[PDB]
Amino acid sequence: STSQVRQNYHQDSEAAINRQINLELYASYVYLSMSYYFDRDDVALKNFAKYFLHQSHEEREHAEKLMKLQNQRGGRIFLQDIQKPDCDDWESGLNAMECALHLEKNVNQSLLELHKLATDKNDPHLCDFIETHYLNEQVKAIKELGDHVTNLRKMGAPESGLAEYLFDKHTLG
Amino acid sequence: STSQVRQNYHQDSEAAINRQINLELYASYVYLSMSYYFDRDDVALKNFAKYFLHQSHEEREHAEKLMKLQNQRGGRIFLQDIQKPDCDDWESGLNAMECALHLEKNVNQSLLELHKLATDKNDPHLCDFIETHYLNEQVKAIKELGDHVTNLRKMGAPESGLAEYLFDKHTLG
Amino acid sequence: STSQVRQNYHQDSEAAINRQINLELYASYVYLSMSYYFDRDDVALKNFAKYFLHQSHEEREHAEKLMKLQNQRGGRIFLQDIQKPDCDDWESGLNAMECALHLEKNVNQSLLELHKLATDKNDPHLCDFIETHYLNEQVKAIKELGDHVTNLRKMGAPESGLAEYLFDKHTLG
Amino acid sequence: STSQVRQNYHQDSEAAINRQINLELYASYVYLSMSYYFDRDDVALKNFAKYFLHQSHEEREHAEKLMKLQNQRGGRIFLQDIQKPDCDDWESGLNAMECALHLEKNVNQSLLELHKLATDKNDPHLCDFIETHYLNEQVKAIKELGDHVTNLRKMGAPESGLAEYLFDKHTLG
Amino acid sequence: STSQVRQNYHQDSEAAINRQINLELYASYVYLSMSYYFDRDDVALKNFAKYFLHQSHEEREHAEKLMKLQNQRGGRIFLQDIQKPDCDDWESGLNAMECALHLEKNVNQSLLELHKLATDKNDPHLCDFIETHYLNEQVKAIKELGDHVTNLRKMGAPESGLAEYLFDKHTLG
Amino acid sequence: STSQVRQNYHQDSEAAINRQINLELYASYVYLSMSYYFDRDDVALKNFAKYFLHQSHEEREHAEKLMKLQNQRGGRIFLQDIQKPDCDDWESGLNAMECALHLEKNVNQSLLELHKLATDKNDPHLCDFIETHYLNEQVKAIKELGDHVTNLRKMGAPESGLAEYLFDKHTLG
Ligand code: NA
Ligand code: NA
Ligand code: NA
Ligand code: NA
Ligand code: NA
Ligand code: NA
Ligand code: NA
Incomplete structure (x- = not known):
């Protein structure tokens, strides 16, 4: 059952890539949730919505690139459930950006652990x-x-509604 | 006196279309009033004025499309007086937008009643x-x-004049 | 309550402009009625319909220009009900053109009275x-x-249907 | 023998679509007959001929779209004889237009019955x-x-030959 | 807590839309799984892979349009876990196409139930x-x-590898 | 009742042209039937479908050219019922092509008989x-x-499904 292409690709690396696929898909889903929060009639920050939708699509691309890698190396993709995001209501533009920052740091930590594994398994292609x-x-x-x-x-966010409005226009627009 | 084109078009439907024509013309007039309020030297919000004038013209187009429908189906147009809007002075950009929202919901309710009538009279073209x-x-x-x-x-509208100014520039401009 | 812009603009002039706004809106409505008469399946003169719709839109533009003037001079717009046209059925192309001629002469008489008022009030801008x-x-x-x-x-209109047909094609087309 | 694609598509709907195919093909044939009547040397109204030929081709397109629908839904097309039109000689441009109006109203009635059937069978795609x-x-x-x-x-048709001539030129040309 | 925009939008409809969002996201995930199966070195059907990836992206677009609708109507989006697909290994091009056909029919059935609900709740916009x-x-x-x-x-699929190869080239390419 | 244009055009020729019109319309209908057979989900040969639809449209053009001829010569068109095709299910691409070949030879035989008639009646224009x-x-x-x-x-048709598939792609595509 070993793939004809497989070379220098540890079972632990294969498993870690499958975990990272799930994490990227999760992140995509979080950003999707955030996007549509900003699209609510009672929130109504269109450029926040656009920003997070872009991030959602980018995370999906990241997941698909890992899936491609798994197949390139002769590993086998095993998908898992994509957990729902932690929140339905993201409270404010500032709160969402803080949650995004936390998410990105969590994803980065997982990637640093993957790099360490690749180095430990002498897998320079993966590293x-x-x-x-x-x-x-x-x-x-x-x-x-x-x-x-x-x-x-x-x-002055989140207390100043004018702050989020102007940030939406000038930074995210 | 039955039109040569008339087919499957109930007298109640014909009457409801005549009512809807009047309502659309009324809405056009309301938006016209709002537009020129914002053009006052003591109000001076040009993009609010432009927004409402556009809406006025759109409502007139909606009325004319109903008039076209009435003739297409062999009904007869009966026009009525167009009532003056409820207000001469619309107070603020926020107040006008709230009044517009109320108007649009009233027009929507009338259209939903028209759809229900069309369905009840088995008039799928009208529905x-x-x-x-x-x-x-x-x-x-x-x-x-x-x-x-x-x-x-x-x-911070309507208390903040700076809010309406910036909304006029950034959203409506 | 005097506008900061107001100068040399008599209360009687302001009132006369409000009356003229209503008259122009009325004329617009008359022409709209005439237009859709010609769109009836039992009338079916498309270029008469187009002619009168154009006139309707022109009269609305005339009303809006008066509204602009009112605000430019620091007067205040007071809208009134737009009365329904005198007829629902305009009988013939000739009859409609005769009714239009009468309407236009009535509007002209009102404008001549407005000019006389402006001259009497030494308002050269308005004149x-x-x-x-x-x-x-x-x-x-x-x-x-x-x-x-x-x-x-x-x-030979209105007795000759061929007359109105050919006029519709050759003059109004 | 149930199609792999079939879902929510009633036998009565399938039968009604087959009837409508035949009716559209019939209408195409009627219009073809009318077209070539106007092409006769003793009739000689080229734009009437063109008008009806266009209608013939349009009705065929309508039939083919129903055939496509039948297959899309997993129904089975059963063709029947296309009956000859009721007349060989269509008498006049006016008489042909009156016959066309009657035909179109008959086709419309059949379509309204089909819509009612679709609604009764809870087939929203078909409706x-x-x-x-x-x-x-x-x-x-x-x-x-x-x-x-x-x-x-x-x-003045059909008594005035000049009427049909001029209509052919100015309306249908 | 009722949205300012909400009108004629039943709680049952809102719930059904949230279920449909999840189903579309699920379908997207299934197609993603299928895509990357065909990208395996031991499967190696690039146009099958491309076909299913396209379908994955289309299903995501469908989900996002429902999310937009939910907000347009003043409903509130509640996301749920996205379940993993039923299979990791999709066996053959034919087996995957059969699984896709089953999935699409399941999604269609859910949409037909949603339409019936909309009709039952007299929600013509949703229908x-x-x-x-x-x-x-x-x-x-x-x-x-x-x-x-x-x-x-x-x-001759799936027994003929030549069949899937040629289908991949000629139909899906 | 003799047409002003008629010259050297025998009653037998006129009758034979009317028969040929019907035969061409019949052939058009046969090809239409065949086309939509190939469009079935359980047949699914799109280029066979396209081929036969093209032939259907060509046969209609042939019929219309004969109708034009009839009028050019001062004959009178008499349409008859268009009989339904002999089959609803055309079995295979090969079987349909064989049926088409038989049809075309039947049409050719009728045209050869028409030419012989024209020659026998010394009608060189018709010949x-x-x-x-x-x-x-x-x-x-x-x-x-x-x-x-x-x-x-x-x-290897019709036993080889791969044969019809490849013919559809390479010959008819
Ligand atoms: Na990522
Ligand atoms: Na409207
Ligand atoms: Na005027
Ligand atoms: Na039709
Ligand atoms: Na619809
Ligand atoms: Na979908
Ligand atoms: Na032929």
Whole structure:
């Protein structure tokens, strides 16, 4: 049952990739939830909605790239349930950005653990894959979300509705 | 005196269409009133004025489409007086948007009653006409006005003149 | 309560402008009625319908220009009910053109009274506005309608259905 | 023998669609007959001929769309004989337009019965298909033919050969 | 807590839309699973992979449109876990197409139940939404999958590897 | 009652043209039946469907050209019922092509009899019409269908579903 393509690809690496697929799909779902919160008539921040929908689609692309990797290396994809997000109501633009920052840091931690595993199993292709496609993307995402949180806080969010309105227009628009 | 084209078109449907024509013309007049309120030198919100004038013209188009339908089906148009709007002075951008939301919901209720009548009289052409041309347009209008009211309220309208100014520029501009 | 912009604008002038707004809106409604008469399956003169719809839209533009003037001068718009037209059935192309000619002459008489008022109140801006935007437009409209009535009568309308058909095609098309 | 695609598609609906196919093919044949009547050297109204040929081709397209629907839903097409039209000689442009109006109203009645059946069998796809593709097309056709009959009658057809000549040129050309 | 936009939108309808969102997301996940099965080195049917990935993305779009509808009507989105697909290994191109056909028929049945609910609750906007955006799309999908299953079976799949190869090239390519 | 245009046009020729019109319309209907057989979900050969629909439309054009001829010569068109095709289910691509070949040979035989009649009645215009517009078209059609039957038989149709699939793609596509 060993794939004809498989070479230097540890069972532990294969399992870790399957976990990461699920995590990326989860993140996609979280961002989808956040997007449609901002689309509510009682929230009505269209550029927050657009921002989070974009992130949702990006996370799905990240999951699909891991699925491609799994097959390229001769591993086998095992999908699991995608858990529902922790919240239905995301409270405010600031709260959502803070939740996103926490999520991105959790995803980054998982990727750092995957890189460590790849290094420990002497799998340089996998290590390089993670470095090239995932780690700088995560650092950039985290920096962007931190910048957003800083700006929102400085502007007076979430108490000032005018802050979120103007941030939506000027930063996210 | 029965029209050569008339088929499956109940007298009650014909009467309901004449009522809806009047209601659309009324709505057009309300929006016209609102438009020119915002054009006053002591109000001076040009994009509110433009928004409501556009809505006025759209409502007139809606009325004319119903008039076309009446003739297409072999009904006879009977026009009535167009009543003056309830207010001359619309107080604020927020108050006008709230009044518009109420108006749109009243128009939607009338269209839902018309659809029910068409269904009750087994007039699928009329039911389809209302679904295709009126019902989603109303849902969209109501959602847009609700979004506007939410944003204005969050920004601090009507107490903050700066709120209405910035909404006029950034949302309606 | 005097507008910051108001200068040399008499209360009687302001009232006369509000009356003229109503008259223009009334004329728009009359022409709308006439338009849709010609769209009936038992009348079926598409170019008569188009002609009168154009006139309807033009009269609305005339009303809106007066509303703009009212605000430019610091007067206050007071809308009134728009009365229904005198007829539902306009009988013939010739009869409608004759009714239009009568309407246009009534509107012109009202504008001449407004000009006289402006002159009497030493309001040269208002007098000029009426001269520039309204009086030659009315003279042209009246001359055009008179030409149409003459042609229809000479061709044998309304007794000849062939007359109205050919006029619809060759003059109004 | 149940199609793998079939879902929510009643035997009565399938039968009614087969009847409607035949009716559309019949209508196509009627219009073909009318077309070539106008092409006769002793009739010689080329634009009447063109008008009816266009209608013939349109009715065939309508039949083919129903055949497509039958297969989409997993029903089975059963064709029947296409009966010859009621007349060989259509007498006049006015008489043909009156016969067309009668035909279109008969087709519309059949479509309204089909819609009622679809609604009674809780087949919303079929009901929507009929509403979307057939009912407004029929209302428009009926209104157009009524307009044509009105104009021809007003112009003096069929006694005036000049009426049909000019209608052929100016309306149908 | 009633939304300012909500009108004629039953709690049962809102709940049914939330169920349909989950079902569409589930279908998206199934198709994703199927896609990456065909990308395996021991399966290696690139056009099957592309076909199912396209379907996955389409189902996600369908889910997002329902989420938009929920907010447009003033309902509240409640997400649930996305269950993992029933299979990890989809056996063959034919087996996957058969599983897809079964899935599409299940989704269609759910949409027909939603339409019945909308009709029962006199919600014509919702009924129209389902008819316009979902029901013909499902009929087309089901017909396409049935055609694919027929062709694969006729060609000798799944026993003939040459059948799936050639179908992949000529139909899906 | 003799047409003003009629010259050298025998009553027997006129009758034979009316028979040929019916035969062409019949052939059109046969091909229509065949087309929609191939569109069935349990047959699913789209290029066979397209091929036969094209032939259906071509046969209708042939019928209309004969109708034009009848009027050009001052004959009078008498339409008859269009009989339903002999089969509802055409069994296979090969069987349909064989049935088409038989049909085309039957149509050709009728045209050869018409040419013989024209020659016997010293009607060179009619003979030339048939030669120019019909006889080479029939020879080409017969040769094409024979080629198709040969290829299908050589490839292993109808027992090989792979044969019809590949013929559909490579010859008819
Ligand atoms: Na990611
Ligand atoms: Na409206
Ligand atoms: Na509909
Ligand atoms: Na005027
Ligand atoms: Na039709
Ligand atoms: Na779907
Ligand atoms: Na032929």
